[PDB]
Design a protein around this nucleic acid. Structure first.
Lengths: 98, 206, 127, 59, 96, 114, 79
RNA sequence: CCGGCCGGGAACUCAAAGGAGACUGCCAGUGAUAAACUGGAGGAAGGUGGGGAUGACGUCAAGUCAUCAUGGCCCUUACGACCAGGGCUACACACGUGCUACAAUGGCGCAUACAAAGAGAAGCGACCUCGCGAGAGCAAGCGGACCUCAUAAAGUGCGUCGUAGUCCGGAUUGGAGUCUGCAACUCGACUCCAUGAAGUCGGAAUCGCUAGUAAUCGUGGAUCAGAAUGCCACGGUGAAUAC
RNA sequence: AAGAACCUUACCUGGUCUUGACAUCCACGGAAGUUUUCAGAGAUGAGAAUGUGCCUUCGGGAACCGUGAGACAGGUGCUGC
């Protein structure tokens, strides 16, 4: 019932943080639904490469927000006690829900 | 003129990003401007300190800035006072609580920013451009890089017609995305004009 | 095995619950005759559904997901291949020979910068 | 009932939760959302979280 | 360079976001009639720079009127430079 | 079925003849069609007085046929007598609805004069 | 083409027109601001729109009410 | 509730992490016993499987002192700076680029299908009511695999038009709602109702394209208070021809 | 130019300059701000009401604001040969 949605611009940090939340729930010994991949947002930007005049010559950039949802079945007080700074990742933003 | 930027083309493959944080689209632009201002301040304050790379990580409560410096002692100061003052001013630029760490850069000539600003300072001091380029490539080959390319560009040796001279030692395989090439630029504000030095150092295939 | 839809073509993946029985296509719990029964090109996509020659004793319910109609038909066809492969593997040679086992990797090419389409280029003036 | 009256803008700090020893100012509350919107610092990360009085126990 | 244009942008943001956009919002929602006009006359009396339409989005570092990208906050040349230096997090070249 | 115009149905639609008359638009056509509710491609034999009176009352209720020459020549004539340039700019012949005149406007200007 | 919530006039032009009608002894009223719908009160007054450095004086009549003031002023010159 | 909606299940589509697979690996022939080429099995993919990013030393004193930075020069009670109005939108004309067509492989009507990629908080905005309509009022769900933009369009199945200047849509100031009200006059977009011009497939020339390509038909984005037929992406149907 | 109604925005009218729209100092005064009136096309002036909090080893310190001279600004000015 505890709902953690964890997102980052890099997928290795994403797998690390979801493994950490899975590890905390596994240490407390509760049933964990496996980490659900959620679809990646590909934000594409097309940017002219020349200061004055060019239209054909232009380069493309993508920001990719990888998304995971653990959807752990059971929260507990020991994980609440160990919750402080458990993610420890500047790359990942985590949103909690009840 | 027609070439890719090596850090950008290797940004997802080999070379790491300079700023690692997540902010939403509301705060992305304000964060990016704060990164630029923090980088600008500590660059201009610690240019004598041989700062090479500046890594700003925001855990979105705070800001953590790691400065990769060849000379750590001048940044740190005596008893941490200088780096504490830097942390305070970086805190008011960012608007959030701040942290600054110093990561030392061993093998200072092997770093691309440092060799470029060294050639720039010599060109400011009117040392010969050829002397600066040859010293750069020879010290890199002595320290053990597989290659180094140095480009000086513009108004060389106080000559009215601008020229571009490249001194190359070793291997700099830019097309290989596996290869780690550190590419950086510096700018010499000489009395006749601006001279741009662009350096590439190739260390290995990762 | 229950004969089901597999396979892919264009932007499609197939959902046909083909079964023993007389063959009449039903789409979204509605008749093909109601949907597009007398449609021209419904025949040129119905023949690929039968192209596997394994429809003759088989009733068909078709609600394939994704893509346009012909890509849906190609997905249905490829599914009837891979399911008949799962039924008996001796007909693999004849389906491979007739070209049904191949997934056509053809897909829409991306639009490119300085080009109006994937390959179409703007008109060039000599002067 | 302890703290049966609910006051908007009231500051409560949960020592058990990750929000302990963290100070924040709530400029905007989304009444139209019907969920209280605070940029709470969680795991040392400040992000806006929708919250309810039933959802989080008051300190 | 272009210092007057940057100061004018600071001026219209300051007049619009802080001084007004509550006064102007109330006058506008009055001016749409809900069952010569006073809301029209008061909206005339309020400064023209209080309109958020007056603000032109410019690059934060350079100040360019054209080329702005709102997620980045910078003009196209500066987002290219920050992209190649790695300042923009997660920006990698797209090659699909 | 001729009212204030030069056009009659001839085994064809009343609506095209009405909008062939100037001073009205096709909304009169659409509304007269909706009130009629029958196929108009049929013959114009037994053209009904009901059709004639509906067309007459509909044009009388809405903008009358032949006010178009009136509206153009009013804007022209009153601002030419006053001396204001609004009538003058519609006298010159170019599009003043905001349209480009740099290389287009051949409909207003006519065939090209080299 | 415009809002039916209200007719649009400039406040300064409205004050100067009501002052001109009330006084009854007026010269042409100079208005740089061209985007003003003429009211029925204006008829019988001379009002000067902005073009160049020159003077465009419009004496408003009964017909020219719903129109804006700038329609009667030409901003460009041609042959 | 015959809606996966709901228990359930994770079997499949799918999401997105890690792998496997394609290397002339095998077989034959040619070739020098070499490289390679030609066919053949296997395989989903076969010989850069398709596409993209990637642009060597240099070149043209090619473009940008108007993104920025920069040497020198000039102005500095003005070449700075502030506001209103205006021009950047004018027009005897002439080419470059795309759009709409000149109908019947097409219109027009009624009923019925089948997508992918994206965006969304001063934002996307369902439902309902009022409007012919653009829209208004009320207003749920949504910082997003959930809700919304957004019941794609070609495809049809039936009818009808069977020269029609056609729904092909041009044309001054109207009759309107929306945006911002500095504010839609010069200068917005939208069903606009304005009169239904020109064009009955375009001379000399010229351009793009070798397969999911040309053609055609729709959808989204960035910019943006509003304002694309451009630009950037997305899917659908889908050729012809290379001696 | 990935967005000319105004703004963007250089080119025509009214207002400004030794601190200029924009940074830094030296001096003096005032919290910063909010709300109004009149004239005017208006940043421009001429007036009114409330707020000297915040603090300084008070021999008073702030982000600030008003004014004055100088240093200084400012230029989308020229030369991409």
């Amino acid at each position: 019932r505890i709902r953690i949605r964890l997102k980052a611009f890099d997928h290795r940090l994403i797998d690390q943080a979801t493994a950490e939340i899975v590890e905390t729930a596994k240490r407390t010994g509760a049933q964990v639904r496996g980490p659900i991949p959620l679809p990646t947002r590909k934000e594409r930007f097309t940017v002219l490469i020349s200061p004055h005049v060019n239209k054909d010559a232009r380069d493309q950039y993508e920001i990719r927000t990888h998304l995971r949802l653990v959807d752990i079945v059971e929260p507990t007080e020991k994980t609440v006690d160990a919750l402080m700074r458990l993610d420890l990742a500047a790359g990942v933003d985590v949103q909690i829900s009840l | 003129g027609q070439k890719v930027h090596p850090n950008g083309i290797r940004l997802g493959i080999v070379k790491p990003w300079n700023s690692t944080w997540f902010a939403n689209t509301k705060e992305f632009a304000d964060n990016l401007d704060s990164d630029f201002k923090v980088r600008q301040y500590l660059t201009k304050e610690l240019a004598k300190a041989s700062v090479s790379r500046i890594v700003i990580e925001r855990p979105a409560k705070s800001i953590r800035v790691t400065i990769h410096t060849a000379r750590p002692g001048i940044v740190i100061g005596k008893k941490g006072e200088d780096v504490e003052k830097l942390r305070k001013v970086v805190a008011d630029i960012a608007g959030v609580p701040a942290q600054i760490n110093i990561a030392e850069v061993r093998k200072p000539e092997l770093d691309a920013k440092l060799v470029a600003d060294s050639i720039t300072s010599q060109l400011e001091r009117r040392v010969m451009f050829r002397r600066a380029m040859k010293r750069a490539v020879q010290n890199a080959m002595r320290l053990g890089a597989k290659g180094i390319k140095v480009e000086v560009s513009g108004r060389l040796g106080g000559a009215e017609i601008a020229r571009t001279e490249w001194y190359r030692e070793g291997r700099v395989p830019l097309h290989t995305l596996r290869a780690d090439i550190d590419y950086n630029t510096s700018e010499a504000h000489t009395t006749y004009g601006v001279i741009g030095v662009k350096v590439w150092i190739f260390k290995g295939e990762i | 095995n229950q004969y089901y839809g597999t396979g892919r073509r264009k932007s499609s993946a197939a959902r046909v619950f083909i079964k023993p029985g007389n063959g009449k296509i039903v789409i979204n719990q509605r008749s093909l005759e109601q949907y597009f029964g007398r449609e021209t090109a419904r025949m040129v996509v119905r023949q690929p559904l039968e192209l596997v020659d394994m429809v003759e004793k088989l009733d068909l319910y078709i609600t394939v997901k994704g893509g346009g109609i012909s890509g849906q038909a190609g997905a249905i066809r490829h599914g009837i291949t891979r399911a008949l492969m799962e039924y008996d593997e001796s007909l693999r040679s004849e389906l491979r020979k007739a070209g049904f086992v191949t997934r056509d990797a053809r897909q829409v090419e991306r639009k490119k910068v300085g080009l109006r389409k994937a390959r179409r280029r703007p008109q060039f003036s000599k002067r | 009932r302890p703290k049966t009256l609910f006051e908007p803008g009231e500051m409560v700090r949960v020592n058990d939760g990750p929000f302990a020893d963290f100070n924040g100012v709530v400029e905007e509350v989304d009444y139209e959302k019907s969920r209280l919107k605070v940029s709470v610092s969680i795991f040392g990360r400040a992000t806006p979280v929708e919250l309810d009085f039933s959802q989080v126990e008051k300190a | 360079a272009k210092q007057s244009m940057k100061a004018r942008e600071v001026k219209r943001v300051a007049l619009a976001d802080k001084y007004f956009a509550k006064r102007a919002e109330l006058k506008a929602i009055i001016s749409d009639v809900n069952a010569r006009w006073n809301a029209v006359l008061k909206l005339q009396t309020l400064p023209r720079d209080s309109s958020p339409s007056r603000q032109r989005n410019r690059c934060r570092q350079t100040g360019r009127p054209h080329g702005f990208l709102r997620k980045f906050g910078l003009s196209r040349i500066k987002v290219r430079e920050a992209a190649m230096r790695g300042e923009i997090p997660g920006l990698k070249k797209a090659s699909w | 079925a001729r009212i204030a115009g030069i056009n009659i149905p001839d085994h064809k639609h009343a609506v095209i003849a009405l909008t062939s008359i100037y001073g009205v638009g096709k909304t009169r056509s659409k509304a007269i069609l909706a009130a009629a509710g029958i196929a108009e491609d049929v013959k114009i034999s037994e053209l009904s007085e009901g059709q004639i009176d509906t067309l007459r009352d509909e044009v009388a209720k809405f903008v009358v046929e032949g006010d178009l020459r009136r509206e153009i020549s009013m804007s022209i004539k009153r601002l030419m007598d006053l001396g204001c340039y609004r009538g003058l700019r519609h006298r010159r012949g170019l599009p003043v609805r905001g349209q480009r005149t740099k290389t287009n406007a051949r409909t207003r200007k006519g065939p090209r004069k080299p | 083409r415009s809002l039916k919530k209200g007719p649009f006039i400039d406040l300064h032009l409205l004050k100067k027109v009501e002052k001109a009608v009330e006084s009854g002894d007026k010269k042409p009223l100079r208005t740089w601001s061209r985007r003003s719908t003429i009211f029925p009160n204006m008829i019988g007054l001379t009002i000067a729109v902005h073009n160049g450095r020159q003077h465009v004086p419009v004496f408003v009549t009964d017909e020219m009410v719903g129109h804006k003031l700038g329609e009667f002023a030409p901003t460009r010159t041609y042959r």
